[PDB]
Design a protein around this nucleic acid. Structure first.
Lengths: 104, 83, 847, 95, 98, 94, 105, 87, 97
DNA sequence: GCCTATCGATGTATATATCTGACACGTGCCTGGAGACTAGGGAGTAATCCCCTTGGCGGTTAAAACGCGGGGGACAGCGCGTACGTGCGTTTAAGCGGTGCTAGAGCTGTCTACGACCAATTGAGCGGCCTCGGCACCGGGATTCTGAT
DNA sequence: ATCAGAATCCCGGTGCCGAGGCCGCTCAATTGGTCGTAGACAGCTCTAGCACCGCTTAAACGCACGTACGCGCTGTCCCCCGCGTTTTAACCGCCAAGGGGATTACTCCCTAGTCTCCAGGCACGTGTCAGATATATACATCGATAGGC
């Protein structure tokens, strides 16, 4: 019965719709618009999450942690592009040393 | 009940660890004061806005949301706080 | 020798022409009557090449009878050029000298003809013959030719008398109208032709005896038996063919797999137009353009040419039409034929040029961008140079061009208006064409062109048949809703054949079997091939003007093709459905993605019931009419206020107007009673014709009557320096002052004429001189002047007729452009003559 | 005694899609929740601005598709767009 | 007599601090620093602990990014010892030192 | 024929106040108008966010002031805040 | 007078501002004092900038203000240069400036 | 000989002197020859992102004519707002 | 004969263009470049001249600012001659890739 | 190796020169700002629980504090010799100037499908809590690195 | 050079409280009805961007070596690091005030929405004079001059 179910979403159609109304974005909002957006947000997140899952697995951990998130973001060039000024708590930094500084 | 000088608490070793994470191999002794100056200017602006938000919120206590909003206004962002 | 052999005439020097069944019979009749020593009249209708036949008669006289001349030709100046040209091209062995021009030119020619007395044929006009009859009489004449001898319809004519005063043995009179509704013309000609057999006095008996031949078959037979030796006249198309008979061909071509690729892709891309009945108009129209491009050439689509963009056969391989055309052109080139190519898309002409370059063929191109002078150069080049192909945009070529040098015409794609194609056809298959012309329309078998043509052809042939037959059975203008259905039917056609053969169906066709016989690189004008009759029970099957290769157009998409379309739509839906039905797809997995929003692109909605459509049509009509009427009235009120500004502006400057108001609304009361041709008896051609005099335009040679000098000016009022303008200032300084005043005072309006006297410094001994300046040009900062407003010249001459008759003053005009070689004088001259000289007003032209 | 909703459950649901067997720390859940909500604001802001530029009262899929294309950098949007439109197709197909 | 040569263990330090993810700043001194600067805008403020943590996190990320740009600027000058002159160029080019 | 609007007349009237006997090019006027609209959007956007942060339905001068405090430079803000306050206290006497 | 701007003693249009804010969906309701405060602030900044522009044109020995003067004025107000740190002005040009290392000796 | 001729790419039309002239306004005294192509690359990438965005706005607007405001929107979104062509 | 020494005219040019308010790129080449690039995005696009004009203004401003930063980098590197390595460093610090 | 001049060359800010469209101003009109009238729920209204931060203790430790010693980089010097500055001429084509053309932007009108508002209602998920083991963490396993061989 | 000998992982086994899962009640997501405007969608009208030719003259192409910069290699020498060695108070565990944030519930004014209207702002309108272009400096630095000391 739920519109989310009707949409095949994980995401909450009614809640998303409510957010769109209260955000004062426009005078009127179509019923499919939240569907598209929710789907997109849902999409994006999981794409991140697989990569995040890959990092935790590579790190021999069963639970994903912020460190995995930092590494994953920078490694999707587009995630880094989209998130160029976003910092992750306990994210740390990418391992990298300049060849000029390396030993003879 | 008044605070001073703890910027030097971001001592040479505090700065050295940060520089090593930054990949720095040699650190000039002049870098320590240069860093403390730049850091203070950065902090001042963030705190200034966070305070502005706190005042707007009519609060006496500074919250993580004020920090988040300050960063966001500065076009910076820190996930894992507030929300 | 068999009809004094055509070879004997050619051996005697006849070059460049075939004495057609009609021309050969005429020359032999002339030759036979010469053996009988009876003069002759070639009464054949205009365009049968009477010129050619007469030239062959001189060839017969010089070659068989050794009559060395001199021979005299009297002809109208418009044909005198033609006579000279035909003599030079067809009878180069007989020296033809032209006695034409002005009094100074004629004085030189009289000296030259007395110094170089070795001409066989002398060309002169009727007006010069009358003026210099005494000069023409000095030469001992053998044979006299009169072209369009109707000039002799009156024995009392000075022409008839002066020629009767010439020493004549044998006469040849050429006329397109041996009887202009009076037997006196024929008898006057006959008495001139053979005065010994037709005395000058038997005019009354000839008229009276033969006037009722329409009623008397007996008199018809008697007059012809008497005329048989003296008058030859024949009727058209049966023997007297005059224009080479036109041949019409429809060409069927296959298509390449690449074309098929795009066909499938284009059609599949926009299935929604078939679903939304109301969105069909714009969408199908766009699609149709793409389909046309595909049939023409896939490279008409961006990125379809494989990179690098290298010139090669892959071009012909990409289009079955081009593939066929390439092979066809090789044949035509070997056949020495000349081809005109018409298409609506310039874009293909570009590719075609690229192709000509590839094959190295000689070509010219004229489309709507080639400017007039450039266009003259292209035509000139094609006429002089061995250019094989002419690339033409279908809309640009129909206007005035003459391309009779070509024998082959190809329509790549047809126009929306069949009148345009017919208008273009008149450019090459034009009077004067001596080769049989072949007309080609290109169609891909079972392609969109065939379907479009089936219905378009029904409309087009009906329209073309309607234009010559005059019974306008124009296929009714079906509203766009039905044109959308028509387009869906077109789109539902041939689908089985088109998609079931994804490979190229580019069949090699023996062109000659379709094209018919080629003789000396000329198309044999055989009537459209009716599949030949094998007699056993008569079965009627339309080998009429709409059937080529025996194939009848106008017939609908097979029902199966229609079914396959609908099936394909659902099949495409299934692909979309499956992709959307299928689970979540990730990027590291590199899944297939669906393109943008479906309703992103727009869908048209339900049709308001036919009743509601009718009501909205009315509402649309009513709303437009109501607003139009109200808005136009309010717009007029603005014009009324601007008029107030104009009057106030003139009034504020204390200026007096010299411009004549635009008199284009007065009935020309020139005795109201059927405007039938006032028969100008042939007495002194200088009295009603414009008299040209070399001299200064500012001093009219008018005796005692008032004189009206006419000149054209711009609306700036700034007086020019040099040339004729200096002559005007020499006679008076006031024209400058009035012109400067009128220009500054906003008195110069297009077609306005300033009238003021010219007697200020030098006045005639009798009569008043008035100068009329016509406001015909405006010059903006871009300095571009329009031809002295052609419209203003007509209005000015109308005013001059009314003013000159009202004042009964003589009119004096300069010969505009006399010093500019190739200047179009005729438009000005005929306006002057029609409005003044023909109306009895004395007109003098100074050069 | 206070009530506070969040999107974590879908995150977890999604987690099990990408990794049915994988688990996640609270800190990571908080980060992603913040991330989702932030991007929602980005997209909605652009759709709003675009509608204003077009003086349009209603936000629709048109706006979603195009705002998305601007924000999800280049191709990143393509991927999302394909699923986004699909879901809408599903929703509108259903009733 | 064995001693690692200058800069060799410094590289090991780089590897250490790049592999570790924990904060490198002394927490209480940073907390005092937060209170000290805030003291300039208002007296007797109260601070959420998480606000201070967020501030510390943001500061570290900011400084580390600066140290990287500084490192590159020194390397561009063919040096390996960072100096304020590098910081000054970097901040100017970033437009922070507008 | 379609009616437009811009800040041009206000800019010009202010110009004659700060500098009499001077004019301004149309290009410069376009820039001024463009700048005014930009700043307006910056202020209104943050004020909207602030209102949401506080769940307020109604925007007030307090939000405007706060946005100005955040957006403007250290001294320019002092003058602007003074003028805004001055205008409100003057108007409210009506 | 009728106009609220004159009541505030302003030149800028408070009514237009209130309308624009209402139409801009910045919030569900807009208090009458916010347009007044904003109009005054915009007017102030306008006067501030125009004063610098007027000075630049006058200094340039000209009576008409042009974008060149605006660029010169903006960058020389160090606060405007930061506020407008990534905003570009058509026909503004740049400030004449050459580094000492590049200067002759 | 005149029907078609190969021609240099329009980016080279941002001639060596155009680049030199720009650098001179930037206060650059001496320039290495590698910079002409380097600048062309940077410029091309910069333009690519701007034009693509503009095209996105126009196509959403369902127009065929590219508009200056579309450019303004792109510039503002990319943080490089230009004053002087609209509002 | 006469010749100015290396850098003397360069200094004049710097002062000339910095004093000038004119555009430095030829309009028609820039215009064609944009339209050719437009072929890369769509088969059919019309353009306002003012839009192209704005694009040139923004492009020149962007590059000039870059040239300033590049010049600073060369000076920091003790050079007078700018090089691609400087441009790359500048963009890198500006966070451009 | 200057250093004080020096012509005069090429150029630059200045004089007064003239020329014009872009700068001004208003006209005629409107359209939307104001001056009304009006309701009700949003922001302020205040009281309150009970929490979060600040206050507060000392311990135990890692950590920072302070120095020597040094070899390598930081730092400058120098000659190499290319390549980038300059002014020459050659040639292309960018500019200022037109023309013709119609695509497509632009407004208007009518009304309907799409969504707005209102409502009943069910159940998704909601706060508060409990259970289990991935992880931290510790001691202490092995491995592999540097500069000393 | 190869190896010793600093110092880096790998590993087992432990044990903590966080992550995942449980239910709960509320309030709102989905279910159910009416209106209405927007947009859309279709129409008609007119504009400006676009395709084309055209001359012109300035620009860039293309010329060359001279020039001086940036180059690679030179040497200098003392500073950040390596490690020791000293000494810190941070971190960490424990308790515990109460300032304050967030919770509760409530009132009245403010702004929104109401209708009628008129006057400030504009688009069209027309003109004019400051700035643009003349033109030829007067007058400054640079080039080599070019000396003298």
């Amino acid at each position: 019965k739920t519109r989310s179910s009707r949409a095949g979403l994980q995401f909450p159609v009614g809640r998303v719709h409510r957010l769109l109304r209260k955000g004062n974005y426009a005078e009127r909002v179509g019923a499919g618009a939240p569907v598209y957006l929710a789907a997109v947000l849902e999409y994006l997140t999981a794409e991140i999450l697989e990569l995040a899952g890959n990092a935790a697995r590579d790190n021999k951990k069963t639970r994903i942690i912020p460190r995995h998130l930092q590494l994953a973001v920078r490694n999707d060039e587009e995630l880094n592009k989209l998130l160029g000024r976003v910092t992750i708590a306990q994210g740390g930094v990418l391992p990298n040393i300049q060849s000029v500084l390396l030993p003879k | 009940k008044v605070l001073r000088d703890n910027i030097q608490g971001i001592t040479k070793p505090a700065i050295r660890r940060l520089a090593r994470r930054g990949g720095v191999k040699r650190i000039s002794g002049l870098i320590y004061e240069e860093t403390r100056g730049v850091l203070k200017v950065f902090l001042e602006n963030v705190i200034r806005d966070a305070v502005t938000y706190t005042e707007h919120a009519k609060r006496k206590t500074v919250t993580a949301m004020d920090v988040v909003y300050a960063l966001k206004r500065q076009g910076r962002t820190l996930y894992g706080f507030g929300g | 020798a068999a009809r004094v052999q055509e070879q004997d005439l050619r051996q005697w020097g006849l070059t460049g022409i075939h004495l057609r069944s009609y021309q050969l019979e005429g020359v032999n009749w002339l030759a036979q009557r010469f053996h009988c020593q009876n003069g002759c009249i070639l009464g054949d209708e205009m365009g049968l090449g009477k010129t050619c036949q007469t030239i062959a008669l001189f060839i017969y006289l010089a070659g068989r009878l050794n009559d060395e001349g001199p021979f005299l030709i009297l002809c109208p100046l418009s044909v005198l050029s033609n006579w000279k040209e035909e003599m030079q091209r067809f009878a180069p062995g007989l020296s033809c000298v032209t006695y034409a021009g002005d009094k100074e030119e004629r004085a030189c020619l009289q000296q030259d003809l007395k110094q170089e007395s070795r001409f066989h044929v002398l060309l002169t006009t009727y007006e010069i013959c009358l003026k210099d009859a005494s000069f023409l009489k000095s030469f001992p004449w053998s044979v006299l030719v009169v072209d369009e001898a109707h000039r002799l319809k009156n024995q009392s004519s000075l022409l008839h008398k002066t020629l009767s005063e010439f020493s004549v043995v044998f006469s040849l009179l050429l006329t397109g109208t041996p009887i202009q509704n009076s037997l006196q013309e024929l008898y006057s000609l006959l008495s001139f032709v053979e005065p010994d057999l037709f005395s000058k006095e038997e005019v009354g008996d000839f008229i009276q005896r033969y006037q009722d031949i329409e009623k008397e078959s007996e008199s018809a037979s008697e007059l012809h038996k008497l005329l048989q030796p003296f008058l030859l006249r024949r009727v058209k198309a049966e023997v007297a063919t005059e224009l080479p008979k036109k041949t019409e061909v429809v060409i069927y071509h296959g298509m390449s797999a690449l074309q098929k690729k795009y066909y499938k892709a284009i059609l599949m891309k926009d299935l929604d137009a078939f679903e939304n009945e109301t969105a069909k108009k714009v969408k199908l129209q766009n699609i149709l353009s793409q389909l046309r491009k595909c049939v023409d050439h896939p490279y008409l689509f961006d990125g379809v040419e494989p990179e690098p963009f290298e010139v090669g056969d892959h071009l012909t391989e990409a289009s079955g039409k081009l593939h066929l055309l390439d092979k066809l052109l090789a044949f035509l080139y070997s056949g020495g034929h000349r081809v005109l190519l018409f298409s609506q898309m310039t874009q293909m002409l570009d590719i075609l040029q690229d192709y000509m370059d590839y094959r190295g063929y000689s070509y010219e191109r004229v489309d709507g961008s080639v400017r007039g002078e450039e266009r003259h150069l292209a035509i000139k080049n094609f006429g002089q140079q061995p250019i094989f192909v002419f690339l033409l945009s279908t809309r640009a070529g129909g206007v005035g061009m003459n391309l009779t040098a070509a024998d082959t015409v190809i329509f790549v794609d047809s126009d929306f208006n069949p009148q345009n194609d017919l208008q273009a056809a008149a450019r090459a298959h034009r009077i004067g064409q001596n080769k049989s012309v072949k007309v080609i329309r290109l169609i891909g078998r079972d392609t969109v062109e065939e379907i479009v043509y089936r219905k378009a052809a029904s409309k087009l042939q009906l329209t073309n048949m309607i234009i010559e037959g005059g019974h306008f059975t124009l296929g009714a203008q079906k509203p766009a809703a039905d044109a959308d259905l028509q387009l869906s039917e077109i789109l539902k056609f041939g689908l089985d054949k088109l998609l079931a053969s994804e490979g190229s169906t580019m069949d090699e066709i023996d062109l000659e079997s379709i094209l018919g016989e080629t003789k000396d690189g000329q198309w044999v004008s055989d009537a459209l091939p009716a599949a030949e009759g094998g007699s056993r029970d008569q079965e009627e099957g339309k080998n009429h003007m709409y059937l080529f290769e025996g194939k009848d157009y106008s017939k609908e998409p097979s029902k199966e093709d229609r079914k396959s379309f609908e099936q394909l739509v659902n099949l495409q839906k299934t692909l979309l459905e499956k992709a959307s039905q299928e689970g979540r797809s990730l990027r590291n997995k590199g899944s297939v993605l669906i393109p943008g929003l479906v309703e992103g692109s727009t869908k048209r909605k339900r049709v308001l019931s036919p009743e509601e459509l009718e009501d909205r049509q009315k509402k649309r009509q009513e709303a437009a009419a109501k607003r139009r009427r109200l808005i136009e009235e309010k717009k007029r009120q603005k014009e009324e206020a601007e008029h107030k500004k104009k009057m106030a502006w003139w009034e504020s400057n204390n200026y007096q107007s010299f411009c004549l108001p635009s008199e284009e609304s007065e009935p020309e009361d020139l005795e109201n009673g059927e405007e039938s041709s006032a028969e100008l008896d042939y007495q002194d051609p200088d009295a009603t014709s414009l008299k040209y005099v070399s001299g200064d335009v500012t001093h009219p040679q008018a005796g005692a009557e008032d004189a009206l000098i006419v000149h054209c000016v711009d609306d700036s009022g700034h007086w020019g320096r040099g040339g004729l303008f200096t002559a005007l200032e020499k006679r008076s300084a006031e024209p400058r002052k009035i012109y400067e005043l009128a220009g500054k005072m906003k008195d110069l309006s297009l077609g306005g004429v300033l009238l003021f006297p010219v007697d200020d410094k030098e006045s005639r001994n009798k009569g008043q001189d008035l100068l009329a300046l016509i406001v015909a040009q405006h010059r903006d900062r871009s300095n571009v002047l329009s031809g002295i407003k052609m419209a203003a010249l007509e209005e000015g001459l109308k005013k001059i007729f009314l003013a000159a008759k009202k004042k009964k003053a003589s009119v004096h005009l300069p010969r505009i452009g006399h010093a500019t070689k190739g200047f179009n004088w005729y438009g000005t001259e005929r306006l002057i003559r029609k409005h003044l000289a023909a109306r009895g007003i004395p007109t003098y032209i100074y050069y | 005694k206070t009530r506070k909703e969040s999107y974590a459950i879908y995150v977890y649901k999604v987690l099990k899609q990408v990794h049915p067997d994988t688990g996640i720390s609270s800190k990571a859940m908080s980060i992603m929740n913040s991330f989702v909500n932030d991007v929602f604001e980005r997209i909605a802001g652009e759709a709003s601005r675009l509608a204003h530029y077009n003086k349009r009262s209603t936000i629709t899929s048109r706006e979603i598709q195009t705002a998305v294309r601007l924000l999800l950098p280049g191709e990143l949007a393509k991927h999302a767009v394909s699923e986004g439109t699909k879901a809408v197709t599903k929703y509108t197909s259903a009733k | 007599p064995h001693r690692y040569r200058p800069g060799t263990v410094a590289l090991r330090e780089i590897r250490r601090y790049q592999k570790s993810t924990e904060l490198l700043i002394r927490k209480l001194p940073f907390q005092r620093l937060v209170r000290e600067i805030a003291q300039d805008f208002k007296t007797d403020l109260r601070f959420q602990s998480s606000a201070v943590m967020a501030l510390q996190e943001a500061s570290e990320a900011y400084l580390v990014a600066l140290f990287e740009d500084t490192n590159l600027a020194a390397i561009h000058a063919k040096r390996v010892t960072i100096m304020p002159k590098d910081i000054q160029l970097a901040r100017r080019i970033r437009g922070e030192r507008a």
